[PDB]
Design a protein around this ligand. Structure first.
Ligand code: HEM
Ligand code: HEM
Ligand code: ARG
Ligand code: ARG
Ligand code: CAC
Ligand code: CAC
Ligand code: ZN
Lengths: 414, 416
């Protein structure tokens, strides 16, 4: 029934009882485990042209409202009872309902708290929630997004935030941010199939050009936003350069590193995920925190299908790239990550290294064990892409399951 | 599309479907409700000592399954030899409750077990395993002889050869043949007065057991442990491996001249000895196997895990790194040098070893071979991706499907 979770570094054991509260199924079965898969095969988020079964929505709604009143220690109170009645009344008559701002704020924080792949959840309680449901056009979306960025960036002293646009509605198109992140570097396919810039952003870069954007020709050209109001073609918006904080990359002791002309933006803001609260779905709810150095130094800069700078750095370090056994890749990666940390610290921009991050996550696991009897966590995503076993989370067994409120993937709007 | 798991490789953007998982007849620990894939020891395979004879009906089906696998492998499925072998197995079980494997069947089953091991990154070599049949072994002393021969053949003066030695299978009511040590070669772990451990903390229990059994302990950081070998229904007997048989490699760094002064070392032969080999229902409680090391096993896990030798800080201090702050990446820097030292020293001593880059590239080739040969390959992502430089290797970007296929190697309870 309840899984026994062990930490092999400390010898300690715990029992996850929270997983029982899971109402949504993952991709695994007793026959085979598909935990290493990035996206769901079916756990997607099918269209919403028709209203969801009132019974199902109503049960998810009640559960959420129940969750909310427990949080404010007012369960069973008169307000709790009236709120449930309001929800019942609205669903029965319209097939849907609406959240109160306070509930939305509670729901957003819970979704982050329940995100199995986020290593920064110890900060889950300090989330600035912007209510953007009052939005009715792509232009208005652009204004909200610009305010989110200004606030979140805060001159380098990053602050976690989320902006919530209008929920999905039956038979009506969704509000969507076509970009996967609010700030991304263009990826231009060139003559021989190669790519200048970020290979991960080729498709979105092309859509922007298709929709009237005048493309640059650099390796780090910040893309424009393609914002979509319900049932309307997406509109193009260029972000004001002064709002997009960037950090030039240099190395503490390797003078030549800066000559590589590398840089990265300060604000990591996922904008293509769906936020689900009490059965309601928010198709556009960009959120941001701050980077963990391995995301830039290891994945973005060193992944083979990304900037893939490992070899260049290796050669500048005059390493023996003749054989794998010289561990030249491992050596270059460490320096690149060091350069990232050094640079962000120099530019006074918030950033956390993987050691500090994983240590904070272990604390979070403990806090959650006492507060809720468990913590859904995805081991493959929590453990850093380098020096895995050198961090504490590597030696910690984890249970992964889906709790709601939750952040989920959704189909690309095109 | 296809009604099987869709597996993607994000580096190459290629896709494959695993149809082999359809052949799994043993449930894992996961459910649609929650994933328990990270658990090291999930109460699943766990071959708990099953005294009373196994349900003849369950054993038979497992036996028939294996014989079918065997005859399919030699392309004679449906043949007269196949149906007669099936009749012979069912008959033997009918009158005795169990059955026995032909030599070639044992060889086939042992290789399939390795091939089927989800956590092994060295499976591209699966077909070249040397299977030593020791099913005639009748004493703990004889177990020692067999083990010494295995160690000698496998070590082969540094040019290691994969091998497995299979002792008699489990029998009803009769005690099991067991090797108490977790590996044929392990360093002692001595509990200290202040509560610390000198040597390898992972072997404190086995070390204490060896002592309780007459072993006169040493006081070093790398004392090779003796073997506690147990024949059916007898207390375990203690055997000391002749030093000349245990090849070790002193560790030195290619450029950091002081590293050699650290006095670190490791043995060349990795030989797991506490796992159970299950073939067609039959259980081989004692069947030690060995290959060769992947450098991160020694350099990162054994030497740097907090609960093992934990030498990260010592080396960082020697490298004069800032160990007072995480952002200096002192742990990362020291780990890399320790791993390089391991590769350098083994190469120097001409002892077989494979670095994590070479190993993972070879495992990718293995996955492709297996996709064509069986429609998939059971792999445990968390165990396949190396403990350092994870995303710098190709396997990190390869999604994997984990499941249990038989023949298989399984964990079994400690005999004490
Ligand atoms: C405050 C600093 C934060 C840090 C250091 C952090 C770090 C991380 C990391 C390392 C990942 C995995 C990234 C990857 O491998 O692509 C992740 C994933 C995630 N984070 Fe956070 N996070 C932070 C804030 C937030 C906030 C504010 C939210 C939401 C309100 C959030 C929601 C998520 C979600 C839902 C995922 C999974 C995204 C996916 O599946 O691609 N995180 N986070
Ligand atoms: C030829 C060289 C070989 C290499 C490089 C190799 C490498 C590895 C590695 C790195 C692991 C995980 C180690 C750990 O984290 O503890 C492993 C696990 C395993 N290997 Fe291999 N292996 C080799 C040969 C063999 C052989 C010959 C067999 C069996 C006939 C085998 C069976 C297994 C099994 C069953 C496991 C999992 C044991 C456990 O769960 O602790 N390997 N191997
Ligand atoms: N620390 C974060 N909030 N990360 C969000 C995901 C960022 C993504 N991994 C990137 O490299 O851009
Ligand atoms: N390469 C191998 N055959 N490894 C088997 C496991 C050895 C174990 N990881 C050790 O470091 O002792
Ligand atoms: C710095 As070199 C090119
Ligand atoms: C090099 As030592 C201290
Ligand atoms: Zn699973």
């Amino acid at each position: 029934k309840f899984p026994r979770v062990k930490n092999w570094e400390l010898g300690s054991i715990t029992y996850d009882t929270l997983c029982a509260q899971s109402q949504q199924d993952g991709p695994c079965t007793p026959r085979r485990c598909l935990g290493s898969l990035v996206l769901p095969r079916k756990l997607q988020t099918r269209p919403s042209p028709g209203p969801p079964p009132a019974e199902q929505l109503l049960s998810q709604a009640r559960d959420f409202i129940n969750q909310y009143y427990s949080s404010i220690k007012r369960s069973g109170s008169q307000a709790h009872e009236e709120r449930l009645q309001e929800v019942e009344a609205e669903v029965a008559s319209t097939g849907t309902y609406h959240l109160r701002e306070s509930e939305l704020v509670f729901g957003a924080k819970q979704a982050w708290r329940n995100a199995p792949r986020c290593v920064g959840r110890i900060q889950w309680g300090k989330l600035q929630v912007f209510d953007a449901r009052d939005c009715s056009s792509a232009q208005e979306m652009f204004t909200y997004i610009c305010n989110h960025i200004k606030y979140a960036t805060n001159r380098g002293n990053l602050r976690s935030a989320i902006t919530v646009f209008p929920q999905r509605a039956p038979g009506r198109g969704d509000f969507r941010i076509w970009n996967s992140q609010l700030v991304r570097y263009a990826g231009y396919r060139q003559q021989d199939g190669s790519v200048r810039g970020d290979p991960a952003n080729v498709e979105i870069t092309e859509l922007c050009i298709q929709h009237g954007w005048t493309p640059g020709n650099g390796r780090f050209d910040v893309l424009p936003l393609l914002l979509q109001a319900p049932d309307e073609a997406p509109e193009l918006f260029v972000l004001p350069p002064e709002l997009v904080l960037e950090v030039p990359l240099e190395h503490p002791t390797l003078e030549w590193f800066a000559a590589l002309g590398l840089r990265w933006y300060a604000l990591p803001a996922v904008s293509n995920m769906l936020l689900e609260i009490g059965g309601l779905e928010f198709s556009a709810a960009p959120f941001s925190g701050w980077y963990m150095s391995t995301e830039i130094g290891t994945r973005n800069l060193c992944d083979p299908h990304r900037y893939n700078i490992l070899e260049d750095v290796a050669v500048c370090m005059d390493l023996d790239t003749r054989t794998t056994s010289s561990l030249w890749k491992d050596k270059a990666a460490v320096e690149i990550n060091l350069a990232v940390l050094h640079s962000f610290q120099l530019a006074k921009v918030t950033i956390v290294d993987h050691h500090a991050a994983t240590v904070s996550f272990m604390k979070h696991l403990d806090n959650e064990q006492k507060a809720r009897g468990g913590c859904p966590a995805d081991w493959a995503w929590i453990v850093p892409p380098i020096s895995g076993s050198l961090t504490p989370v590597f030696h910690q067994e984890m249970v992964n399951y889906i709790l709601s409120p939750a952040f989920r993937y959704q189909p690309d709007p095109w």
